[PDB]
mmCIF file of C-alpha atoms in Angstrom:
data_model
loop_
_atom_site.group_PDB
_atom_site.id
_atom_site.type_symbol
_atom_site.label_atom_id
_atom_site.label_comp_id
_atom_site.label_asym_id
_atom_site.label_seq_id
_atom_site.Cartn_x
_atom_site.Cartn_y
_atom_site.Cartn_z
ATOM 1 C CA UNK L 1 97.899 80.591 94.103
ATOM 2 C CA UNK L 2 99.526 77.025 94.211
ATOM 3 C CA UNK L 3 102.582 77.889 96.473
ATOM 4 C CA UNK L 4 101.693 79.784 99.468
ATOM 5 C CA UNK L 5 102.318 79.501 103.374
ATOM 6 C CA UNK L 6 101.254 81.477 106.308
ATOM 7 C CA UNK L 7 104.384 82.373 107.767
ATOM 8 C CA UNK L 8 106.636 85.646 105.642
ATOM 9 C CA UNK L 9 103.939 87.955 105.017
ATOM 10 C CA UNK L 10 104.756 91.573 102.725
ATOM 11 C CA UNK L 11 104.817 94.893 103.858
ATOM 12 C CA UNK L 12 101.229 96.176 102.496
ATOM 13 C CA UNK L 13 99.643 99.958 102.882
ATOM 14 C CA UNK L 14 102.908 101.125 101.219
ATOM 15 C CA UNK L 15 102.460 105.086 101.467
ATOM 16 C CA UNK L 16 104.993 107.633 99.705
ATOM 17 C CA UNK L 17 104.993 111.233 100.945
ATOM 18 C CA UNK L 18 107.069 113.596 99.792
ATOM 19 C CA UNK L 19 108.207 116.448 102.295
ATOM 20 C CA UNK L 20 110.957 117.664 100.126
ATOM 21 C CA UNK L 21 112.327 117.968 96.464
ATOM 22 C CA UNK L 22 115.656 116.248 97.876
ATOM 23 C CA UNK L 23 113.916 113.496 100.064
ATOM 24 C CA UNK L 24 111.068 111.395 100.291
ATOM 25 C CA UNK L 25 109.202 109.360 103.263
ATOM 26 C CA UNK L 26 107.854 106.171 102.480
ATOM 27 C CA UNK L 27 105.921 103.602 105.442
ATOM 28 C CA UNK L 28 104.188 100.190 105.740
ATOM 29 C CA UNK L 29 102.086 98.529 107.830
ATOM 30 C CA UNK L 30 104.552 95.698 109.595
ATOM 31 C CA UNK L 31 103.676 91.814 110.065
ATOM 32 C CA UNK L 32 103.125 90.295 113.380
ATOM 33 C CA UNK L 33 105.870 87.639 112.297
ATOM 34 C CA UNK L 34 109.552 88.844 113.451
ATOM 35 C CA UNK L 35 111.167 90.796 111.134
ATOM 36 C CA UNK L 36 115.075 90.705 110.590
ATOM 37 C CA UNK L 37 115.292 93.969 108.561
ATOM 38 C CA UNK L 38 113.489 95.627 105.258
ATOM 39 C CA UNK L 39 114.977 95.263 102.183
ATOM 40 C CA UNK L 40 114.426 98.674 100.461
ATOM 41 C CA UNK L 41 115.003 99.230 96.424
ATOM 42 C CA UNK L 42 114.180 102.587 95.392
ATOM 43 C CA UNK L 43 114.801 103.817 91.622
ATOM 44 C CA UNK L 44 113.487 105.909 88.996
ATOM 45 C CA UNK L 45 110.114 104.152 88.171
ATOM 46 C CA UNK L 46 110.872 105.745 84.898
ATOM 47 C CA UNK L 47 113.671 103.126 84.090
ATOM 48 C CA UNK L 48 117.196 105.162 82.431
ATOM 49 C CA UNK L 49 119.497 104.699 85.504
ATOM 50 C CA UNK L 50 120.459 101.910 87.612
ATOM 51 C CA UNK L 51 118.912 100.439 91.062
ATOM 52 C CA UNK L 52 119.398 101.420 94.384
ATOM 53 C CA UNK L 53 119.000 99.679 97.569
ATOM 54 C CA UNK L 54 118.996 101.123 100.979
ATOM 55 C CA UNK L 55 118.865 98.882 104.556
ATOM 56 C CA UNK L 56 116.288 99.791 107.142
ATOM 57 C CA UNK L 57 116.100 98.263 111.146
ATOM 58 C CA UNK L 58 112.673 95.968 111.080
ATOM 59 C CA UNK L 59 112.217 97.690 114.657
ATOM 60 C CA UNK L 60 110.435 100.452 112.755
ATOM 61 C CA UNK L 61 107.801 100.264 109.456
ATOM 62 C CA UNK L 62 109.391 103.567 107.848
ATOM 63 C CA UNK L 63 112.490 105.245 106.265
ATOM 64 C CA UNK L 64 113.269 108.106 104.345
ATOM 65 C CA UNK L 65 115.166 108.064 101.022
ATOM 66 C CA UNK L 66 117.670 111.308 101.153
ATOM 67 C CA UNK L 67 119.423 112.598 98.031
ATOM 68 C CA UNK L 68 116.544 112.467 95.607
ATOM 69 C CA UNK L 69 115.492 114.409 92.872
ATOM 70 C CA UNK L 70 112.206 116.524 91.906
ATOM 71 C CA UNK L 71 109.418 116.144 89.689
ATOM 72 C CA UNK L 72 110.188 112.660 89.937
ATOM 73 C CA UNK L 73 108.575 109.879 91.648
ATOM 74 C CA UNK L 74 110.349 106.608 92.486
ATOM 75 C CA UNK L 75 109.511 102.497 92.342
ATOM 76 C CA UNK L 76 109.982 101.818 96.145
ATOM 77 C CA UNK L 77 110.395 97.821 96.921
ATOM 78 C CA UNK L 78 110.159 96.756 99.946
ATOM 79 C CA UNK L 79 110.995 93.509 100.911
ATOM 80 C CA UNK L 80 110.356 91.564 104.570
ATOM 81 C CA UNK L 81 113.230 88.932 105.586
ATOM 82 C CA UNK L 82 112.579 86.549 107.882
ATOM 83 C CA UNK L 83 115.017 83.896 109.249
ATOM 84 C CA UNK L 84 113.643 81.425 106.681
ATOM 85 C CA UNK L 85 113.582 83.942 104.173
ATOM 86 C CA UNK L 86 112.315 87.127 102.541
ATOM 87 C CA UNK L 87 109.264 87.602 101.195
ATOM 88 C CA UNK L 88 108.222 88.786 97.753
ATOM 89 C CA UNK L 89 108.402 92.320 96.804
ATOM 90 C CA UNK L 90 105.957 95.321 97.184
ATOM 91 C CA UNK L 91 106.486 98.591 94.235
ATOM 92 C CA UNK L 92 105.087 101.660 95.038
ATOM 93 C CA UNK L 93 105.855 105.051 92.821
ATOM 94 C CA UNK L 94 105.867 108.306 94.568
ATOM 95 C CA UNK L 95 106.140 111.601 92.510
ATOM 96 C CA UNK L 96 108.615 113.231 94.474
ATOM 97 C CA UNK L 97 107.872 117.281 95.853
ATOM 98 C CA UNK L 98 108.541 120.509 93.486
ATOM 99 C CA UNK L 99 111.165 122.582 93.860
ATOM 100 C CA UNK L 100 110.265 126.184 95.615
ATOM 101 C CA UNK L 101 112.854 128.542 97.760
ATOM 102 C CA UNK L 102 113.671 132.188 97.535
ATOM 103 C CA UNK L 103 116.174 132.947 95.037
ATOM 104 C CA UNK L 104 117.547 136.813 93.776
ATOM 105 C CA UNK L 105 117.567 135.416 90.329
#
């Protein structure tokens, strides 16, 4: 494109594994530029409710987002900041896991 500098690069190789119907992991392969912290905006890819945004330490490329529902997958964006700035953002929708437990009904 026109406007483009080597310098805030994207987290890229965004993958979203689901472990359970009530949480799901999501990683990245991390820059070599230092990283404040990741700017993480999870919501229902879908698009009925509202956005959320959770904070994760740069230090590591991962995070999991607790409290989540099933059946469901979610628009993850991730976001690098850098002392400059932040880079753009990266959306990545992960069906969540099924629900499954013993039950006596």
């Amino acid at each position: 494109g026109s406007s483009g500098s080597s310098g805030r690069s994207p987290p890229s190789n965004l993958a979203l594994a689901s472990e359970t119907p009530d949480s799901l992991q999501v990683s990245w392969t991390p820059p070599l530029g230092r990283v404040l912290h990741y700017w993480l905006t999870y919501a229902p890819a879908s698009g009925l409710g509202p956005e959320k945004s959770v904070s994760v330490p740069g230090a590591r490329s991962h995070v999991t987002l607790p409290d989540l529902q099933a059946a469901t997958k979610y628009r993850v964006l991730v976001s690098a900041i850098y002392a400059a700035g932040r880079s753009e953002a990266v959306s990545a929708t992960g069906q969540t896991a099924c629900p499954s437990g013993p039950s006596s009904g």
